Amino acid sequence: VKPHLRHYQVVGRESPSEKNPEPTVYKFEVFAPNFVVAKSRFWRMMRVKNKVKATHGDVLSCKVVKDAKLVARNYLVDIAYYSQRCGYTRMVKEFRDVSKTGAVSQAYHDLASRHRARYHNIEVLNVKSIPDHEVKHLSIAQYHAPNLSFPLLQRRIKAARKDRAIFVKKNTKRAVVA
RNA sequence: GAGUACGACCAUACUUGAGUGAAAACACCAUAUCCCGUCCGAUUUGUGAAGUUAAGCACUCACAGGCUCAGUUAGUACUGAGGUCAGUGAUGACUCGGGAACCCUGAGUGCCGUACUC
Incomplete structure (x- = not known):
């Protein structure tokens, strides 16, 4: 659906102080809806890892x-x-998508x-396109078969919003109402 | 480079145990006729100058205790503002900010002022 998250590379730094005349510059990959969220997730991680604030920032x-390329x-x-019971659970979760920012959106x-x-x-953490022979779960590994061939059964073919109707004629493509 | 008298901050100066100490001065020390005060010339007061750095004082030295100062603990605990947040609730996270403490570790262990003197 052209995903709702975007891959921001937020680069930042503490500040030129007189204690620290040249501070360390940090790189950060974040998947955010926009850059205002993305800057704040960066200063969240500068605080909880480096004791750096955004005020001195x-x-x-x-x-x-x-x-x-879409492949x-x-x-x-x-x-x-994080859940309140059993806090900070970490999973691996292999996916199958055309882009890297869409794969995190599925996650x-x-x-x-x-x-x-x-x-x-x-x-x-660490979104990477892996090859077919490294995929472990068979619910993603079943798409590497070179001859997949499934049918689209049990469908919901709806009309095209310009010709949709309310009462059509039971064996017929008419429209008695709407 | 030190002494003595008056000192300011009042342990980075204290406590314990060793070591060293030129000069000069402080100090132990000698003493009881007067001044004076004691159960006691111990303290205290007077009058001294034979003796000694033994002790005080000073300095130096401890994988010393303490104290002082950063660091770590730790963006942790906690907390100001927010939600028709999550959770049966207890409570928890998130968001915009502020942000500790002991333990621990490293450092060093008095500093400035006036007058007189070696």
């Missing part, structure tokens, strides 16, 4: 990362999430359904 860069790949979205849609975890209770 520089964002040197926050730019999107363009995707790739069906296998992605290991090594992902972690956010089934960390939400299988486990009921929301955006801010999820951290995403």
